[PDB]
Amino acid sequence: AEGDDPAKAAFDSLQASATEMIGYAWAMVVVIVGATIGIKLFKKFTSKAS
Amino acid sequence: AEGDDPAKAAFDSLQASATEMIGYAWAMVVVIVGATIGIKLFKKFTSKAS
Amino acid sequence: AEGDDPAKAAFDSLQASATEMIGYAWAMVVVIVGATIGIKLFKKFTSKAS
Amino acid sequence: AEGDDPAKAAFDSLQASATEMIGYAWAMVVVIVGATIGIKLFKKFTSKAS
Amino acid sequence: AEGDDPAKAAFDSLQASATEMIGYAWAMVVVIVGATIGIKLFKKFTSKAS
Amino acid sequence: AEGDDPAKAAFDSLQASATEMIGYAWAMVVVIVGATIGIKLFKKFTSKAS
Amino acid sequence: AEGDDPAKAAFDSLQASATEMIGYAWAMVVVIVGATIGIKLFKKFTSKAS
Amino acid sequence: AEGDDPAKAAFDSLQASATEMIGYAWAMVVVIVGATIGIKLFKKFTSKAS
Amino acid sequence: AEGDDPAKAAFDSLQASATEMIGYAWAMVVVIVGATIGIKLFKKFTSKAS
Amino acid sequence: AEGDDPAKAAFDSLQASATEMIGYAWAMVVVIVGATIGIKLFKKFTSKAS
Amino acid sequence: AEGDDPAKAAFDSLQASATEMIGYAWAMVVVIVGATIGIKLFKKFTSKAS
Amino acid sequence: AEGDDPAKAAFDSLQASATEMIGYAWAMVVVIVGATIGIKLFKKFTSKAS
Amino acid sequence: AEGDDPAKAAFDSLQASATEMIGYAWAMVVVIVGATIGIKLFKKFTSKAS
Amino acid sequence: AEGDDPAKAAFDSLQASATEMIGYAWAMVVVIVGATIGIKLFKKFTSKAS
Amino acid sequence: AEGDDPAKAAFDSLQASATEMIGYAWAMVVVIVGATIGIKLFKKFTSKAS
């Protein structure tokens, strides 16, 4: 109930850091998935021609 | 039985502090799990296309 | 055998105080375990999706 | 044998919480599987036409 | 050899309490495993269809 | 060499008491280990199914 | 060398319990594999017809 | 009841010193935890990509 | 150099007890591994059929 | 309140040392993760070609 | 702030060792991937002929 | 400088006893580690098969 | 530098045991791979006939 | 500053012993990794053939 | 204020001895950590190959 008010910023500081790097894990998958899905389509173009 | 009444607030003060930071451990996992599960779905989108 | 009757309340007073704070050590673990176990389940939700 | 009667509710409280979130892990897979299986069928519709 | 007869109930009281909460650790895993295994089967239903 | 013969029973009395409670520490671990190991097996049943 | 004779039953009791649940992990896979393999054959029946 | 008034400052002086170094034990864990948690996230970024 | 000759049996007695239970930890893993590996083979039988 | 002013540098000296080695734990993970993630991509290049 | 200058070389020595073996994990995947991808191409040569 | 010559054997007698039981602490760990490491290998045999 | 000469055999004894069981992990994979690859060939015989 | 010169050999003796057994922990992992990696390659040989 | 000048060297002599052996506790951890971290990397090389 006391001595934690200035510790409350401690964890909001770690959590705020989490949101910064979390944006990298979310875009990371999408950066990789861009090709993941786009490549799928390249092969679709391949098998469909038969 | 005596001399503990004003100590009773001592631990309710530590426990009340616990409930404050406990809310961070609960939301912490969910902040991280948001992506954890959301990313799962990104890959599902990847394997399903085959 | 004598001079201890009014000391008998002395220790029942310390022991009665023990039962007061002991209730905090028992609920303390459970307050913390609530999340301990609940969080376990959050991650179960994470690994299971694969 | 004593001092555990009011702790018995402690774990029934954590277990009752488990049943709440467990319903999410069970429906979660089915929410995802809905499409998982439904999509399978979309592709079946694709290969069958040959 | 003496002064322990009324202490013998002390530990049978702690051990009897152990058997009470032990039933929760045993059913706990099974409550969680119910879904653990049941979900496995949901996914089996998913991969098998290919 | 003298005045210890009736004290010899003193310690055999404390040691005999030790053997009584020692049986509780030995079975205690096994009471807890019963589940400890049995639960291990529950999870083995879980990971093996993949 | 002594005080373990009545503990020897302790572990034979946990191991004997292992053999009980182990029969479930062995039949479990086979219960699931019954379909696993049987379904394979259903699809073989499908691709072979071309 | 007398001769302790100028000793009352003695302990408020030791306790006031405690609050000074206590701020170091609280921030110390957070200085170390900053990385503790931040690193967790680095690895999450690692396992998630599979 | 003296007063330890009859203590030498003390530890050979604990060590001899170790060799008794150690045989359980060695066979324990193998009892569990029997299925561990045998089950692997059950699944090999499953994936190979494709 | 007194005799701690020249001790205040004591802990700022240990904490300042922490920040020095902490930079190694942060870059350490990244030095290792460089490859961790980069290698992931090498394998992505492998499975995608099918 | 002091007594860490000659420890600074301690970790640069472990990190410098990391860069040595890290070159093996990077080339390792490529040594294996050489064939991984090259073999892909061997099979492409196989299916294309139809 | 005098009256300690026949006490010098006193401690060489306790130290010589130390070397006797010390051989048990050294082999003790190895008796237990035999299985510790050997079991590791049993599980390696388990995970490797995937 | 002393008291380790008779411990040197301790680890050469565990390592020598490793080489014994390691031969099982190496042949184990090959025992299983015999069929793994041989079966591949059975199916090659199947698809080639079209 | 005095009475430690003949103790300096004490720790160089324990540290020199560390370097002896440390060579076992380093080669130990490699003895086990030999197969760890070599087996990986056995399976690569397995999946590649498809 | 007097009779301590030639005692001042007493503790600088014990403290100077501390700095001598302290260098062993600092390098000790690093001697052990060399492998601790280096081995980590050996296993990274192991899991990454999948």
Side-chain angles (χ1 to χ4, degrees):
Chain A
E2 61 201 306
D4 184 72
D5 293 281
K8 192 197 306 251
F11 279 137
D12 277 292
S13 286
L14 276 68
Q15 282 192 176
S17 286
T19 305
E20 279 200 1
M21 302 150 304
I22 281 303
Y24 298 5
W26 274 87
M28 273 281 321
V29 164
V30 158
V31 175
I32 307 161
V33 162
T36 308
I37 284 180
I39 282 61
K40 310 211 54 40
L41 281 42
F42 277 54
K43 292 217 164 312
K44 310 206 98 47
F45 295 42
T46 282
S47 285
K48 286 185 176 319
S50 298
Chain B
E2 61 201 306
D4 184 72
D5 293 281
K8 192 197 306 251
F11 279 137
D12 277 292
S13 286
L14 276 68
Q15 282 192 176
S17 286
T19 305
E20 279 200 1
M21 302 150 304
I22 281 303
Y24 298 5
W26 274 87
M28 273 281 321
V29 164
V30 158
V31 175
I32 307 161
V33 162
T36 308
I37 284 180
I39 282 61
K40 310 211 54 40
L41 281 42
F42 277 54
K43 292 217 164 312
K44 310 206 98 47
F45 295 42
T46 282
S47 285
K48 286 185 176 319
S50 298
Chain C
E2 61 201 306
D4 184 72
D5 293 281
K8 192 197 306 251
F11 279 137
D12 277 292
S13 286
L14 276 68
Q15 282 192 176
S17 286
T19 305
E20 279 200 1
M21 302 150 304
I22 281 303
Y24 298 5
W26 274 87
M28 273 281 321
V29 164
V30 158
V31 175
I32 307 161
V33 162
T36 308
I37 284 180
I39 282 61
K40 310 211 54 40
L41 281 42
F42 277 54
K43 292 217 164 312
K44 310 206 98 47
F45 295 42
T46 282
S47 285
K48 286 185 176 319
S50 298
Chain D
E2 61 201 306
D4 184 72
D5 293 281
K8 192 197 306 251
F11 279 137
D12 277 292
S13 286
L14 276 68
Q15 282 192 176
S17 286
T19 305
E20 279 200 1
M21 302 150 304
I22 281 303
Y24 298 5
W26 274 87
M28 273 281 321
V29 164
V30 158
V31 175
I32 307 161
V33 162
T36 308
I37 284 180
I39 282 61
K40 310 211 54 40
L41 281 42
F42 277 54
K43 292 217 164 312
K44 310 206 98 47
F45 295 42
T46 282
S47 285
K48 286 185 176 319
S50 298
Chain E
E2 61 201 306
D4 184 72
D5 293 281
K8 192 197 306 251
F11 279 137
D12 277 292
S13 286
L14 276 68
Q15 282 192 176
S17 286
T19 305
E20 279 200 1
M21 302 150 304
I22 281 303
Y24 298 5
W26 274 87
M28 273 281 321
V29 164
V30 158
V31 175
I32 307 161
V33 162
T36 308
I37 284 180
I39 282 61
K40 310 211 54 40
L41 281 42
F42 277 54
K43 292 217 164 312
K44 310 206 98 47
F45 295 42
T46 282
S47 285
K48 286 185 176 319
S50 298
Chain F
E2 61 201 306
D4 184 72
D5 293 281
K8 192 197 306 251
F11 279 137
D12 277 292
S13 286
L14 276 68
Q15 282 192 176
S17 286
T19 305
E20 279 200 1
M21 302 150 304
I22 281 303
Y24 298 5
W26 274 87
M28 273 281 321
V29 164
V30 158
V31 175
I32 307 161
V33 162
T36 308
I37 284 180
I39 282 61
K40 310 211 54 40
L41 281 42
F42 277 54
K43 292 217 164 312
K44 310 206 98 47
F45 295 42
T46 282
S47 285
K48 286 185 176 319
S50 298
Chain G
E2 61 201 306
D4 184 72
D5 293 281
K8 192 197 306 251
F11 279 137
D12 277 292
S13 286
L14 276 68
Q15 282 192 176
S17 286
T19 305
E20 279 200 1
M21 302 150 304
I22 281 303
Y24 298 5
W26 274 87
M28 273 281 321
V29 164
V30 158
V31 175
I32 307 161
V33 162
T36 308
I37 284 180
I39 282 61
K40 310 211 54 40
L41 281 42
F42 277 54
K43 292 217 164 312
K44 310 206 98 47
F45 295 42
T46 282
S47 285
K48 286 185 176 319
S50 298
Chain H
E2 61 201 306
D4 184 72
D5 293 281
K8 192 197 306 251
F11 279 137
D12 277 292
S13 286
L14 276 68
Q15 282 192 176
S17 286
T19 305
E20 279 200 1
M21 302 150 304
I22 281 303
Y24 298 5
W26 274 87
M28 273 281 321
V29 164
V30 158
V31 175
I32 307 161
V33 162
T36 308
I37 284 180
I39 282 61
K40 310 211 54 40
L41 281 42
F42 277 54
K43 292 217 164 312
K44 310 206 98 47
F45 295 42
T46 282
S47 285
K48 286 185 176 319
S50 298
Chain I
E2 61 201 306
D4 184 72
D5 293 281
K8 192 197 306 251
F11 279 137
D12 277 292
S13 286
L14 276 68
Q15 282 192 176
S17 286
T19 305
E20 279 200 1
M21 302 150 304
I22 281 303
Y24 298 5
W26 274 87
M28 273 281 321
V29 164
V30 158
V31 175
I32 307 161
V33 162
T36 308
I37 284 180
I39 282 61
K40 310 211 54 40
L41 281 42
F42 277 54
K43 292 217 164 312
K44 310 206 98 47
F45 295 42
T46 282
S47 285
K48 286 185 176 319
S50 298
Chain J
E2 61 201 306
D4 184 72
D5 293 281
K8 192 197 306 251
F11 279 137
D12 277 292
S13 286
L14 276 68
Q15 282 192 176
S17 286
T19 305
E20 279 200 1
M21 302 150 304
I22 281 303
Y24 298 5
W26 274 87
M28 273 281 321
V29 164
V30 158
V31 175
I32 307 161
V33 162
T36 308
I37 284 180
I39 282 61
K40 310 211 54 40
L41 281 42
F42 277 54
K43 292 217 164 312
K44 310 206 98 47
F45 295 42
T46 282
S47 285
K48 286 185 176 319
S50 298
Chain K
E2 61 201 306
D4 184 72
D5 293 281
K8 192 197 306 251
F11 279 137
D12 277 292
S13 286
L14 276 68
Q15 282 192 176
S17 286
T19 305
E20 279 200 1
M21 302 150 304
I22 281 303
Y24 298 5
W26 274 87
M28 273 281 321
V29 164
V30 158
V31 175
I32 307 161
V33 162
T36 308
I37 284 180
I39 282 61
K40 310 211 54 40
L41 281 42
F42 277 54
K43 292 217 164 312
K44 310 206 98 47
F45 295 42
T46 282
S47 285
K48 286 185 176 319
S50 298
Chain L
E2 61 201 306
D4 184 72
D5 293 281
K8 192 197 306 251
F11 279 137
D12 277 292
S13 286
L14 276 68
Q15 282 192 176
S17 286
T19 305
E20 279 200 1
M21 302 150 304
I22 281 303
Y24 298 5
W26 274 87
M28 273 281 321
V29 164
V30 158
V31 175
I32 307 161
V33 162
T36 308
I37 284 180
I39 282 61
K40 310 211 54 40
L41 281 42
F42 277 54
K43 292 217 164 312
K44 310 206 98 47
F45 295 42
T46 282
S47 285
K48 286 185 176 319
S50 298
Chain M
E2 61 201 306
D4 184 72
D5 293 281
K8 192 197 306 251
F11 279 137
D12 277 292
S13 286
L14 276 68
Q15 282 192 176
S17 286
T19 305
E20 279 200 1
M21 302 150 304
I22 281 303
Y24 298 5
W26 274 87
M28 273 281 321
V29 164
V30 158
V31 175
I32 307 161
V33 162
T36 308
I37 284 180
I39 282 61
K40 310 211 54 40
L41 281 42
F42 277 54
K43 292 217 164 312
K44 310 206 98 47
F45 295 42
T46 282
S47 285
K48 286 185 176 319
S50 298
Chain N
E2 61 201 306
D4 184 72
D5 293 281
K8 192 197 306 251
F11 279 137
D12 277 292
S13 286
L14 276 68
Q15 282 192 176
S17 286
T19 305
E20 279 200 1
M21 302 150 304
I22 281 303
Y24 298 5
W26 274 87
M28 273 281 321
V29 164
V30 158
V31 175
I32 307 161
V33 162
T36 308
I37 284 180
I39 282 61
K40 310 211 54 40
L41 281 42
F42 277 54
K43 292 217 164 312
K44 310 206 98 47
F45 295 42
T46 282
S47 285
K48 286 185 176 319
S50 298
Chain O
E2 61 201 306
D4 184 72
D5 293 281
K8 192 197 306 251
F11 279 137
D12 277 292
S13 286
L14 276 68
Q15 282 192 176
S17 286
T19 305
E20 279 200 1
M21 302 150 304
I22 281 303
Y24 298 5
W26 274 87
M28 273 281 321
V29 164
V30 158
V31 175
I32 307 161
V33 162
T36 308
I37 284 180
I39 282 61
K40 310 211 54 40
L41 281 42
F42 277 54
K43 292 217 164 312
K44 310 206 98 47
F45 295 42
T46 282
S47 285
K48 286 185 176 319
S50 298

